[PDB]
Design a protein around this ligand. Structure first.
Ligand SMILES: CCCCCCCCCCCCCCCCCC(=O)OC[C@H](COP(=O)([O-])OCC(O)COP(=O)([O-])OC[C@@H](COC(=O)CCCCCCCCCCCCCCCCC)OC(=O)CCCCCCCCCCCCCCCCC)OC(=O)CCCCCCCCCCCCCCCCC
Ligand SMILES: COC1=C(OC)C(=O)C(C/C=C(\C)CC/C=C(/C)CC/C=C(\C)CC/C=C(/C)CC/C=C(\C)CC/C=C(\C)CC/C=C(/C)CC/C=C(/C)CC/C=C(\C)CCC=C(C)C)=C(C)C1=O
Ligand SMILES: CCCCCCCCCCCCCCCCCC(=O)OC[C@H](COP(=O)([O-])OCC[N+](C)(C)C)OC(=O)CCCCCCCCCCCCCCCCC
Ligand SMILES: CCCCCCCCCCCCCCCCCC(=O)OC[C@H](COP(=O)([O-])OCC[N+](C)(C)C)OC(=O)CCCCCCCCCCCCCCCCC
Ligand SMILES: CCCCCCCCCCCCCCCCC[C@@H](O)O[C@H](CO[C@H](O)CCCCCCCCCCCCCCC)COP(=O)(O)OCC[N+](C)(C)C
Ligand SMILES: CCCCCCCCCCCCCCCCC[C@@H](O)O[C@H](CO[C@H](O)CCCCCCCCCCCCCCC)COP(=O)(O)OCC[N+](C)(C)C
Ligand SMILES: CCCCCCCC/C=C/CCCCCCCC(=O)OC[C@H](COP(=O)(O)OCCN)OC(=O)CCCCCCC/C=C/CCCCCCCC
Ligand SMILES: CCCCCCCC/C=C\CCCCCCCC(=O)OC[C@H](COP(=O)(O)OCCN)OC(=O)CCCCCCC/C=C\CCCCCCCC
Ligand SMILES: CCCCCCCCCCCCCCCCCC(=O)OC[C@H](COP(=O)(O)OCCN)OC(=O)CCCCCCCCCCCCCCCCC
Ligand SMILES: CN(C)C(=N)NC(=N)N
Ligand code: SF4
Ligand code: SF4
Ligand code: SF4
Lengths: 176, 156, 70, 96, 215, 115, 318
């Protein structure tokens, strides 16, 4: 079905003609717009008092990246390169070798945060919940190089944000 | 010293005015400019802080490079940056402006607006949220707070 | 809230008070406590000049009266 | 009534610990609302809640005047909140 | 330019202020999306569509997913289809808010821009709740949707939808019957139905010209 | 005298503001900064070329109507005369002729802009 | 003491201009559901000071294609005339008491026209030229309509003296007497001051800052100050002309308070209109006054010529 947005004609009776003439000579719709703006003036603003008040977020939010650990302290990442394979922007560089104790662990785990599109594919493809996107989003820097994270930086992010990351994963893991 | 105290107070006053009155040029390139509009929106009102969009580059203090910078667009961005009078600052926003972004390995995309203009602040994200951009703006303000031009000149 | 606009309006109103009140006080100060004489016409100007002449101090606002005629 | 609003304003003045505290919270937070203190972290930041405010203004933080080794009396960042209070303040959970 | 949307070079020949010809120079935001898609996989190319029309993002994702599923000869579940349509209409609300308010801002009115952009902020909250990203969700994928809705999303969407018609009415109170807006918009850019069809217009352009067509 | 002093004060204040504007701040000018602004791209032509004026007839009519308002201005004093009937007739005559000029131009399409 | 009076007229006007900038910011924000400046100072009271310091410490540049002499003169002329327009206003006592106080304001407004024209021509750019010619057309229309409207309203007064306006409005208001002329005068003052919906000389959406596209730093601030001073002065003129305040010779401060309140109400109405309405096209603005206001203005001028004669209510000559 369909409807006509504008196909109505005005009645030509004397009362309606006089009403339209009063609207033309006395700016009735303009006064109506003024009244609407005045109402909005006397309403309460929708502004939050940042940085003392923060906009709402969800457990699924994709912010800064982090490399997680098992509760024993062992790194979760097993150098499987699924995140590197699935990364759309090719932001992840991974190099690995057998460790001293024979573990399959990474030696280089770089993420170019100026190349990443924050799409969350890396944490979807991780089978051990190693790489995650944390809740942090206020990590702007003054130089370009500071946004080229490496394995040490990502492990520091994980250690710094482990509690909130764990809480969010606990909250949202049953939907995955 | 008396002169040192005078110049310190004077360039505290000067940095306060520039920090508190920021006029971004009305300049957006791609999806990152929508978050600029949402930062201008009532929720994160940028006009509270003294941050006001001005259309003319002559009446602009900050260039927010929000979007992908292409080979066909780089000359215009450089031109408007040059036509901006000093002191002037640059805030790159989003992955495309920071480095290459989703289009890093492209024939028609500049891998970083810092290849074109000197960038003062980098805001990460795709797109960075309006709160992230506001944090970047406040970080730029704090960076301005530390400038000591009269103090450098006095000891020069 | 909308009443946070008032302090700026209050400052603007206080600024706009200064010109008129200052002009009135200066007029009363320089005319011996009276309104500044309005002379839109030659008759009023000649009245002012005659007031200057008869005052004896070269000030039209110095008014004399019956004690001066006798 | 305007009298009730003025009395609430006076209560806000007295609710921050006198006129000096009112001016301190006005000049370093641009807000003088009074809310129930949810808690305080190890760095000095105080967290307040007021469920009567609309969503987005019902939780807020008054930052400390000194964190680590930086004087943050005026220079307050959004990154000065530890992750747990960050989650509570950004409303990823209802539990402080 | 404020009215050029950022990356449009409109070379215009003007006799005084009357327009003699418009020569839109485009490509200042050309990135090579199709070549990059050739180099990506089907799952890796979805965010490209997320970033094509960055005001109707889940709509672009839905179109791409429909194409890929048609090629694959598979079928999304009914709940996935219903979520797709629901968020497609939410995205349509976002896009139309942006379009109308930016149009009115180019004409000279900004208050509706601010109001309807607060509404856009609420819809961005919905997007972030389902996907974790405020606008570039990458939520609708070939085969269905990535994740299920949280356990309050439907109620919050119901509240938003309940309180939105008043916002539309307030938007109409400033523009619809305003004589300045009518002078600016009425009998401007008139296009006949045959010309629209031949030039290849689609959607609101056709329907404004009067063509009864909706996909 | 007083008006001259006021004008001198205002002009001196404005000139002092300009002088402070052009000497107080640090200056750094080069060719790219001082080039004309055309939204990021070099202008094709020059701004000194002819710029067609589509309301050229309305400007001439404005000159004539400015004459009309100059004629009409001394009316407040003219209403203090004893020949009120003659004064009223002449004032209405001038205003009716002005209205006739406006109506003639409107009907002959002199108020429409050139295409 | 006359120099002291000049300073007492000038400096508060500039301070009120700065705080009017702040007030417009906050009023537009609250009408747009925002808050406006409330961070720089308490309730954002130091925002004008910060903006002035930034503008006058920023680098000004003269374009390579510009005519430097007229590029510099234009802001000087704009600010000088904006400050000069205030000297005949009685609040309740004028600084300079003129016998023809209104024709002086008309002439000074027509001279203040040329600031934007010469700044647009001197800038030597296409957007500046377009803004200058938009100013030309706008001045044409508003000038003719304003002249005739003022003629009629003052014909209800008896002379061109604003103190005589006060004496006329001792009992009732010229808004009660002649409200249609008041409506058309308000629209014409909007057009004269280049306010929305008639902000066409500097139209951001269509032109990139219009006539002052090349102006920056201090010279730009002078144009802004001139515009806001003209806004306040025209609203004060409207208040004196149509909303007459009761005057007590022995306590004149009451007139000052009433006049300031009325002027503030009119200026806030200006800001309200800017927040409310879209922008005109300048051909539609020319057709608005010439084809709608001008016929009604002529008819009302004839009516206000006839009315004192037919009702034996001609005002005194002096
Ligand atoms: C009440 C007023 C009474 C006035 C009485 C006198 C005037 C009578 C009417 C006019 C007739 C004479 C006009 C003056 C001719 C002077 C000689 C000449 O050719 O000058 C070129 C000069 C323009 O040259 P230009 O193209 O800009 O310079 C580019 C050069 O090629 C290259 O130049 P450059 O790039 O090397 O630049 C160097 C220098 C160039 O400096 C100049 O060109 C000097 C201009 C001033 C005249 C000095 C002698 O520039 C500066 O110094 C920059 C500052 C300039 C701003 C200050 C100007 C003050 C004017 C007074 O012409 C003018 O300045 C014309 C304006 C003169 C009148 C000024 C006052 C106007 C008031 C308007 C409102 C009035 C309301 C009340 C009624
Ligand atoms: C191109 O793609 C696009 C974008 O981009 C990517 C976009 O974003 C958007 C989105 C668009 C929007 C979001 C809309 C824009 C956003 C808005 C918020 C619009 C709102 C606009 C405003 C609120 C207007 C504000 C603009 C300005 C310029 C205000 C700035 C203020 C000034 C310039 C005033 C400065 C001048 C001053 C203060 C004058 C005072 C100076 C003086 C010297 C006066 C003092 C003089 C004296 C003599 C005083 C001295 C006296 C003394 C010392 C003694 C006094 C006594 C005492 C006791 C003190 C769109 C659509 C888009 O399509
Ligand atoms: C034309 C106007 C005349 C009346 C002026 C009335 C007073 C004006 C008040 C407003 C001043 C505005 C500027 C405020 C201060 C900031 C800028 C500043 O300091 O500028 C000064 C300028 C500064 O030079 P600048 O070009 O480097 O200015 C840039 C300044 N900074 C770095 C702060 C941005 O000083 C000079 O130009 C001269 C410096 C010393 C060299 C002297 C050379 C000889 C000529 C002058 C001395 C006297 C000679 C006597 C003998 C002559 C015969 C041989
Ligand atoms: C040109 C400027 C110099 C000439 C102007 C006139 C000065 C002498 C006036 C003598 C008569 C007098 O005082 O009359 C009182 C009259 C007022 O009184 P009145 O006209 O009612 O009657 C005199 C008073 N009674 C009734 C007692 C006799 O002044 C005026 O009417 C105002 C005249 C203003 C003329 C302005 C001309 C243009 C100047 C604009 C300058 C702008 C800045 C330019 C530069 C900008 C760029 C740098
Ligand atoms: C208008 C006409 C021209 C005026 C000419 C000057 C007139 C006087 C200028 C007025 C000075 C205003 C100073 C304002 C002080 C800032 C208030 C305070 O908050 O600033 C703090 C201190 O500021 C700086 O330390 C220095 C400020 C300026 C110090 C005064 C210098 C001397 C001024 C007095 C001399 C004036 C005469 C000499 C010049 C003519 C740091 O705050 P900040 O971190 O940012 O705020 C962040 C926002 N938060 C709080 C929400 C997070
Ligand atoms: C008729 C009307 C005339 C104009 C009226 C204008 C009114 C404007 C509103 C004035 C309100 C000002 C309130 C005070 C604001 C600043 C208060 C405070 O927060 O700022 C101080 C900064 O103040 C400055 O340093 C000096 C005072 C300048 C601010 C007052 C400005 C007064 C008005 C300015 C002149 C107005 C006319 C301009 C011409 C503190 O900075 P500082 O102490 O360092 O920081 C270190 C503190 N530590 C050590 C604890 C960490
Ligand atoms: C002094 C303070 C005054 C305050 C008044 C403020 C009013 C509200 C302000 C908001 C408006 C500001 C922005 C609006 C700008 C545009 C205004 C506008 O459009 O009005 C003009 C409007 C638009 O015309 P169109 O729609 O284009 O129709 C054209 C047909 N071909 O038309 C007008 O000209 C209206 C003119 C109003 C004059 C008043 C009408 C006169 C009434 C007649 C009765 C009086 C007869 C007197 C004789 C009495 C005998 C006893
Ligand atoms: C003694 C001289 C005192 C200052 C005179 C300044 C005149 C001058 O030569 O400078 C012209 C200067 C611009 O020079 P630029 O070409 O832009 O580059 C240099 C920037 N400083 O113009 C001005 O400063 C405006 C002059 C004040 C207007 C007063 C006229 C009345
Ligand atoms: C009670 C008695 C009075 C008490 C107060 C007395 C002082 C009041 C202020 C007087 C005016 C300012 C005087 C000069 C200030 C110092 C300027 C200076 O020396 O600047 C030098 C320097 C230039 O750069 P430099 O380091 O030399 O390096 C070369 C660049 N490649 O660095 C710069 O140029 C920095 C850029 C800014 C310089 C200009 C601004 C200086 C501060 C002005 C404050 C007041 C502003 C008023 C504005 C007008 C009114 C609104
Ligand atoms: C990016 N889009 C869609 C815009 N409309 N942009 C704009 N600057 N007006
Ligand atoms: S979020 Fe996406 S673009 Fe970023 S590193 Fe992970 S897979 Fe790559
Ligand atoms: S998907 Fe996980 S385990 Fe595999 S390489 Fe990436 S971070 Fe390591
Ligand atoms: S960084 Fe992401 S959101 Fe920003 S312009 Fe690039 S693709 Fe768009």
């Amino acid at each position: 079905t369909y409807k006509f947005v504008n196909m109505r004609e005005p009645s030509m009776d004397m009362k309606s003609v006089t009403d339209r003439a009063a609207q033309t000579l006395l700016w009735t719709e303009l006064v109506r717009g003024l009244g609407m703006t005045l109402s909005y003036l006397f309403r309460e603003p929708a502004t939050i008092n940042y940085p003392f008040e923060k906009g709402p977020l969800s457990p699924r939010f994709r912010g800064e990246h982090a490399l997680r650990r098992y509760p024993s302290g062992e790194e979760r990442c097993i150098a499987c390169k699924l995140c590197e394979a699935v990364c759309p922007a090719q932001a992840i560089t991974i190099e690995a070798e057998p460790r001293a104790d024979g573990s399959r662990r990474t030696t280089r785990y770089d993420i170019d945060m100026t190349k990443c599109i924050y799409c969350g594919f890396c944490q979807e493809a991780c089978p051990v919940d190693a790489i995650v996107e944390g809740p942090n989003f206020e990590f702007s820097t003054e130089t370009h190089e500071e946004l080229l994270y490496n394995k040490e930086k990502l492990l520091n992010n994980g250690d710094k944000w482990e509690a909130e990351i764990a809480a969010n994963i606990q909250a949202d893991y049953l939907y995955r | 010293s008396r002169g040192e105290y005078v110049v310190a107070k004077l360039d505290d006053l000067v940095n306060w005015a520039r920090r508190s009155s920021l006029w971004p040029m009305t300049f957006g390139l791609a999806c990152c400019a929508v978050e600029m509009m949402h930062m201008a929106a009532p929720r994160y009102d940028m006009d509270r802080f003294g941050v006001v969009f001005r259309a003319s580059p002559r009446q602009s203090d900050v260039m927010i490079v929000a979007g992908t910078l292409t080979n066909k667009m780089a000359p215009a961005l450089r031109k408007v940056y040059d036509q901006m009078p000093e002191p002037r600052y640059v805030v790159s926003m989003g992955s495309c402006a920071n480095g290459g972004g989703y289009y890093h390995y492209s024939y028609s995309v500049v891998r970083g607006c810092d290849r074109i203009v000197p960038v003062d602040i980098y805001v990460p994200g795709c797109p960075p949220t309006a709160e992230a951009l506001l944090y970047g703006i406040l970080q730029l303000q704090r960076k301005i707070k530390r400038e000591k031009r009269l103090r450098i000149w006095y000891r020069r | 809230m909308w009443f946070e606009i008032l302090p700026g309006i209050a400052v603007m109103a206080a600024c706009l008070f200064i010109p008129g009140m200052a002009t009135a006080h200066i007029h009363k100060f320089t005319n011996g406590g009276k309104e500044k004489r309005v002379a839109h016409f030659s008759y009023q100007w000649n009245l002012m000049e005659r007031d200057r002449c008869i005052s004896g101090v070269n000030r039209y606002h110095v008014t004399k009266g019956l004690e001066n005629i006798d | 009534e305007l009298v009730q609003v003025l009395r609430r304003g006076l209560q806000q003045v007295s609710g921050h610990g006198g006129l000096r505290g009112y001016l301190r919270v006005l000049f370093r937070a641009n807000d003088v609302r009074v809310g129930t203190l949810v808690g305080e972290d190890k760095y000095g930041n105080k967290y307040y809640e007021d469920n009567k405010q609309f969503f987005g203004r019902h939780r807020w933080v008054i930052y400390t005047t000194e964190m680590n080794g930086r004087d943050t009396f005026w220079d307050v960042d959004g990154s000065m909140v530890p992750p747990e209070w960050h989650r509570w303040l950004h409303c990823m959970t209802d539990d402080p | 330019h404020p009215a050029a949307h950022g990356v449009l070079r409109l070379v215009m020949e003007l006799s005084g202020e009357m327009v003699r010809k418009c020569d839109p120079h485009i490509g200042l935001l050309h990135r090579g999306t199709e070549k990059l898609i050739e180099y990506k996989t089907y799952l890796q190319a979805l965010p490209y569509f997320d970033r094509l029309d960055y005001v109707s993002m889940m709509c672009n994702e839905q179109a791409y997913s429909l194409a890929v599923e048609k090629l694959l000869n598979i079928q999304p579940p009914p709940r996935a289809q219903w979520i797709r349509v629901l968020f497609g209409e939410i995205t349509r609300l976002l896009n139309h808010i942006m379009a109308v308010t930016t149009h009115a801002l180019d004409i000279g009115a900004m208050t509706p821009f601010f109001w309807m952009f607060e509404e856009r902020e609420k819809m961005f909250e919905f997007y972030e709740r389902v996907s974790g990203a405020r606008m570039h969700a990458a939520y609708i994928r070939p085969g269905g949707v990535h994740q299920d809705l949280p356990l309050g999303l439907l109620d919050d969407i119901y509240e938003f939808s309940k309180n939105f018609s008043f916002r539309i009415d307030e938007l109409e109170e400033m523009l619809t019957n305003n004589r300045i807006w009518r002078n600016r918009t009425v009998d401007i850019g008139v296009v006949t139905a045959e010309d629209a069809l031949n030039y290849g217009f689609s959607g609101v352009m056709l329907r404004g010209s009067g063509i009864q067509w909706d996909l | 005298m007083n008006i001259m002093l006021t004008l001198l004060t205002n002009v001196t204040l404005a000139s002092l503001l300009v002088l402070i504007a052009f000497w107080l701040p640090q200056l750094n000018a080069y060719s790219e900064k001082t080039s004309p602004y055309e939204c990021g791209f070099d202008p094709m032509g020059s701004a000194r070329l002819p710029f067609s004026m589509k309301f050229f007839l309305v400007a001439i009519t404005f000159l004539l109507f400015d004459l009309e308002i100059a004629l009409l201005l001394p009316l407040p004093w003219a209403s203090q005369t004893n020949n009120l009937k003659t004064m009223l007739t002449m004032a209405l005559f001038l205003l009716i002729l002005l209205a006739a000029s406006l109506a003639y131009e409107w009907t002959q399409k002199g108020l429409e802009w050139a295409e | 003491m006359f120099m002291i009076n000049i300073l007492s007229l000038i400096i508060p006007i500039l301070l009120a201009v700065a705080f009017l900038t702040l007030v417009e910011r906050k009023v537009l924000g609250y009408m747009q559901l925002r808050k406006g400046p409330n961070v720089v100072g308490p309730y954002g009271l130091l925002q004008p000071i910060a903006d002035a310091l930034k503008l006058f410490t920023k680098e000004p540049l003269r374009p390579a294609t510009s005519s430097i002499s007229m590029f510099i003169i234009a802001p000087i002329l704009a600010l000088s005339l904006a400050l000069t327009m205030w000297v005949p206003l009685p609040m309740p006592y004028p600084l300079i008491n003129m016998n023809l106080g209104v024709l002086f304001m008309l002439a000074m407004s027509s001279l203040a026209v040329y600031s934007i024209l010469w700044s647009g021509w001197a800038s030597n750019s296409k957007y500046a030229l377009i803004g200058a010619l938009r100013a030309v057309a706008q001045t044409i229309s508003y000038e003719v309509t304003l002249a005739i409207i003022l003629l009629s309203v003052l014909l209800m007064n008896g002379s061109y003296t604003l103190s005589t306006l006060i004496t006329t409005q001792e009992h009732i208001w010229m808004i009660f007497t002649s409200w249609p002329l008041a409506m058309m005068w308000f629209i014409s003052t909007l057009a004269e001051t280049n306010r929305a919906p008639f902000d066409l000389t500097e139209g951001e959406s269509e032109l990139v800052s219009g006539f002052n596209v090349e102006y920056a730093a201090g010279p730009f601030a002078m144009f802004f100050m001139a515009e806001y001073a003209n806004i306040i002065m025209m609203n004060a003129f409207t208040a004196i002309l149509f909303l007459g305040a009761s005057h007590d010779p022995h306590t004149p401060e009451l007139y000052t308070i009433n006049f300031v309140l009325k002027t503030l109400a009119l200026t806030i109405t200006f800001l309200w209109i800017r927040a409310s309405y879209p922008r005109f096209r300048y051909d539609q603005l020319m057709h608005l006054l010439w084809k709608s206001f001008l016929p009604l203005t002529l008819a009302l001028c004839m009516w206000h010529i006839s009315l004192p004669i037919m009702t034996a209510s001609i005002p005194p000559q002096s």
